[PDB]
């Protein structure tokens, strides 16, 4: 069956394996897909959500090693807007209001893996050292 | 021009872009290439090189995520020898003594990239907090 073209977005700084799972799901969502991923700007990100370590530039060569991206949009738009999936050509965008999407039949939702992260790791570190 | 096989190693502890950039290099060395991928287990590792983080099992599914990979071996042998070699059909070996390895051509040097470990990330978090 033909390709199917879907889109991602996120802030993906200090990536671990809970971001790549969520990638990995949104790219086999269908068994013909073009991943396109979206990374938010610094000025945007640190406005709305809060603090990231790396910038933009750094944040996307880390995204272009992982294998199932197809396609980067850096930086993507902070409000995805049906224009921007008409340009695009988009068919279905991996979330997880966003309304508009679902009544349009354009939203498939992903999970997210807990307990993955890189700040999780340096607790990990942090517990070879007994308080007392 | 014909498939290449070629085999680098590692712990592959906090994955990050200058693990990812090596590996990119390996697989980059002819333009038709199988990139072999061994991942040191984790009592060889605390033994001979130091503390590890995660566990060969969560070292590995991280690496199953990047695109230059094509197979992993797990755990991997911490010694390669010329036996090795002939069994899984290892044209070259990209490190950065292991002299057998050049007098036989089949050693390939690639390079590190500084400054961009998990490590250095977590110093930059903390330097939003002056000492005084």
Known sequence: SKNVVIYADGVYDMLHLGHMKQLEQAKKLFENTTLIVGVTSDNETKLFKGQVVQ????????????RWVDEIISPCPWVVT????????????????????????????????????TTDLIVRILKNYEDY
């Open 55 to 66: 910038t933009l530039e750094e944040r996307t060569e880390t995204l272009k090693h992982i």
């Open 82 to 117: 049906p224009e921007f999936l008409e340009k695009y050509k988009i068919d279905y965008v991996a979330h997880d209001i966003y309304a508009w999407l679902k009544r349009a039949g354009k939203f498939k939702a992903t999970q997210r893996t807990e307990g993955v992260s």
